[PDB]
């Protein structure tokens, strides 16, 4: 399977006083491994996974210098964008950036990406070929031209196909005990009478990793979506994820219904019957 | 490992 390294950055302007609030988080697949918060006293990139603590003082120093420089970049951006969108100095605005790289099952570069948003809307993104840009509006055309002229795409491409993949591979190895371990969901069904004549069947998937999963109900071997409820996948807080899907059924007919669970942690899909 | 991010919009 493929693996990903992604960094997420949020800067929020504080028009009343001071510099923007800046929060940066790094993930390998669905695991957070580093963070920086401008509001924290340490003013350092901090570890969030045990395997990144294998890296020495030189790592934390280098990552901190870069992440602080990135915060100043965003600070500049917030001022520039206020001007592009003719907004007043009194409202708070948001810049978000995500970038990262994937390696495939062959452990080689697969994909790179770099996306930017302003006030919750696409602004500019690097195209899949890592050579050109997609501007969502006329303001972003200005940025696209500036970045084309300064060959930003080439710089980012060299990073994405080089350093980014090299370090992802390094992290995967160092963290193999957890990053490359799949946790199959622990599944069970609960049953709740809502009356003397019908019942709710809830099919649970717990403690799974990674987050991707499919849960579906069938009745007599056909997909059933009517009269079901499916919650969004949610973090358990210990690095694993949870999901459930429920269906309401006539009392005594429970045996017709099957819960189907698909997850990379499973040799083949599971079929549950009450 | 972060990329240096100097390019402003």
């Amino acid at each position: 399977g493929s693996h990903s390294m992604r960094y997420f950055f949020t800067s929020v302007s504080r028009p009343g006083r001071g510099e923007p609030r800046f929060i940066a988080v790094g993930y390998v697949d669905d695991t957070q491994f580093v963070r920086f918060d401008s509001d924290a006293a340490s003013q350092r990139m901090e570890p969030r996974a045990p395997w990144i603590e294998q890296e020495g003082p030189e790592y934390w120093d280098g990552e901190t210098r870069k992440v602080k420089a990135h915060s100043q970049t965003h600070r500049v951006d917030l001022g520039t964008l206020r001007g592009y969108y003719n907004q007043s100095e009194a409202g708070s605005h948001t810049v978000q950036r995500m970038y990262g790289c994937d390696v495939g099952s062959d452990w080689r570069f697969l994909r790179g990406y770099h996306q930017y948003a302003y006030d919750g809307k696409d602004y500019i993104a690097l195209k899949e070929d890592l050579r050109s840009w997609t501007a969502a509006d006329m303001a972003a055309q200005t940025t696209k031209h500036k970045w084309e002229a300064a060959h930003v795409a080439e710089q980012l491409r060299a990073y994405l196909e080089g350093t980014c993949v090299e370090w992802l591979r390094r992290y995967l190895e160092n963290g193999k005990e957890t990053l490359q371990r799949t946790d199959a969901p622990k599944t069970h069904m609960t049953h709740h009478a809502v009356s003397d004549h019908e019942a709710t069947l809830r099919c649970w998937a717990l403690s799974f990793y990674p987050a991707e999963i499919t849960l579906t109900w069938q009745r007599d071997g056909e997909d059933q979506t009517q009269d079901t409820e499916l919650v969004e996948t949610r973090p358990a807080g210990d690095g694993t994820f949870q999901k459930w899907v429920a269906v309401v059924v006539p009392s005594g007919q429970e045996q017709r219904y099957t819960c189907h669970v698909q997850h990379e942690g499973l040799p083949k899909p599971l079929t549950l019957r009450w | 490992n972060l990329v240096p991010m100097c390019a402003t919009v």
């Binding site: 949020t10 957070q32 978000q96 973090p235 | -």
Partner: protein, 100 residues
């Protein structure tokens, strides 16, 4: 200036059993902007020792956070998650149901 209202789920880390220590979670997602107030309540009262995850976002740029605290489910005690956000007229409060 897009505004998106938070989605809320309130739930425990492990299947809940009366008298047995656990973790109460309030997961807020799909919201924008990022400024948000989240509290965990016990019997309609704010719990003090509540931690949260680092702010991150999904592919549509919507934000998400997990707020959490250690707790012990009991017969008599009630738990909830209280959320305020620029998109909400007053705080939304969702009661914890151990089967959801």
């Amino acid at each position: 200036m897009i505004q998106r209202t938070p989605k809320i789920q309130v739930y425990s880390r492990h299947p809940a059993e009366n008298g047995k220590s656990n973790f109460l979670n309030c997961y807020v997602s799909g919201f924008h902007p990022s400024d948000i107030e989240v509290d965990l309540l016990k019997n309609g009262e704010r719990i003090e020792k509540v931690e949260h995850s680092d702010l991150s976002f999904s592919k549509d740029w919507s934000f998400y956070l997990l707020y959490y605290t250690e707790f012990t489910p009991t017969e008599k005690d009630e738990y909830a998650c209280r959320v305020n956000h620029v998109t909400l007229s007053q705080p939304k409060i969702v009661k914890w149901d151990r089967d959801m």
